[model samples]
Target: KVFERCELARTLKRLGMDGYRGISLANWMCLAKWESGYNTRATNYNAGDRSTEYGIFQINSRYWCNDGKTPGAVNACHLSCSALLQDNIADAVACAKRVVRDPQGIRAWVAWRNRCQNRDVRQYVQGCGV
Candidate 1:
């Protein structure tokens, strides 16, 4: 529920999301902003696909998290959906990294498909001066 500091780019790099996982900190920041506004507890219970997105990454229950309410969920992350909606994002990062390994990669996020795909996101992290 806490903000966990105020800079996502710095945090993402600190977590080893520094463009080595087929995604850049800039892109991740943009997607995070669009998906969850960087809120760890963010959840979209009414995704219209009978699925919900959780955490700062907005991981979907359809394939990642297992919440009994969402039928046919694969639980790929092997953790409860509520786990993603917590202050400690270590688990969420691991799950998201796995998702990036799949064919769709970060494209799994609709926000990335619509907004960040081929866009210049460097501005998202420019202030960090990394």
Candidate 2:
């Protein structure tokens, strides 16, 4: 299912994701907006790379999910990329939390570093009343 920004914020908050595994909810929200505008079905084929990003978190086939087309791809998340495309995001959230525990932490998302990192995002959730 599609989610608005505020709805995403509330969902994340209820899941205790605002500061999960050293990631702020604001930052994650920002990353989500840039990556997929909170759409669970979003996908992106990276430039010059056979790997693709899937879902709102934009998980890559390079190391997280096997694209089938990606030879010997690592399935660190141990899940299908399409699983993230569905509205039931339990798997997505679980995988994302697992991804954060990786060496990259929140930097796993380029959009976060460039768009949400080291910035004041307190206002992103101010009026959401979550």
Candidate 3:
């Protein structure tokens, strides 16, 4: 699913991402914008890491979801990487919550630090009444 910005923002808020782990809705919106461009089926393979990033949140196969191909993966999210690629983002949102429970929090996503952090992230959630 390719989500409109406002729609995704509201959906995320309804799913409890507004301030999960102290990360704001706009920040998550920003991360998703840069990471996957609001597309639920988005994916990227990291040749160097020998792993793939999946779905709207781009959860990695290495330490999170298992794709059955990432060497030495931890599968901490306890689900298949395919789960992240679904148009229904509920599973993706839950896995994203699991990610921020780590020490790095939202910084677990490099796109957040590089593009969302310290920026005017309000645009991500603006005008959606979220």
Candidate 4:
């Protein structure tokens, strides 16, 4: 499921992403835009760590989802990596919440830092009616 920007913004809002841990919906929008382009089932593999990032938020195997292949990996989210790839996005959203429960908050996503940090991310939700 590839979400349109506004659709995603509204969905994230309904899912309580706005102001979750003091992170705005626009920042979440910015993270998703660069991290996965609003596409569910997007994936990236890292040969160095033998881990695969999964789903819309590109949650990683090392400390989030357990794919059974990442060495010394921690399944902090306590769900299978496959769960993150679903179009429903409910499970993925829950895992995303868990990821930010730590002190890192949104910084858990490096893409957010590179693309959204300190940038004018309002454009991501500019016309989304969020």
Show where candidate 1 strays beyond 4 Å: 2-6
Cα miss at 1, model 1 (Å)?
3.5
Which pairs of residues have clashing backbones in candidate 4?
A: none
User: Which rank order by lDDT, best down to worst?
Assistant: 3, 4, 2, 1
Kindly report which residue pairs in candidate 1 clash with one another.
Answer: none
| TM-score of each candidate structure, all chains considered together | 0.90, 0.92, 0.98, 0.97
Instruction: Show the colliding residue pairs in model 2.
Output: 1-87, 18-25
Q: For model 3, how does the per-residue alpha-carbon lDDT over 1-130 read when each residue is reduced to its tens digit?
A: 9999998998899999998998889899999999999999999999997999999988999999999999999999999999998988999999999999999999988888899888999988879999
Model 1: lowest-lDDT 10 consecutive positions: 1-10
Tens-digit lDDT track of model 4 for 1-130:
9999999999999999999999999998998899899999899999887999999999999999999989988999999999998889889999999999999999989899999998888899888777
Query: What TM-score quantifies how close candidate 2 is to the native fold?
Result: 0.92
lDDT of each: 0.82, 0.85, 0.93, 0.93
Prediction 4 global C-alpha lDDT:
0.93
Model 1, range 53-114, lDDT digits (tens) per residue? 88988898988999888878899889899889878888888888888988888888888989
Model 2 lDDT tens row, 2-85: 798788889888877878977778888888888898899999996686889999899898889876877568899999888989
Task: List the candidate 2 regions with Cα displacement exceeding 4 Å.
Answer: none
Model 3 scores a C-alpha lDDT of 0.93
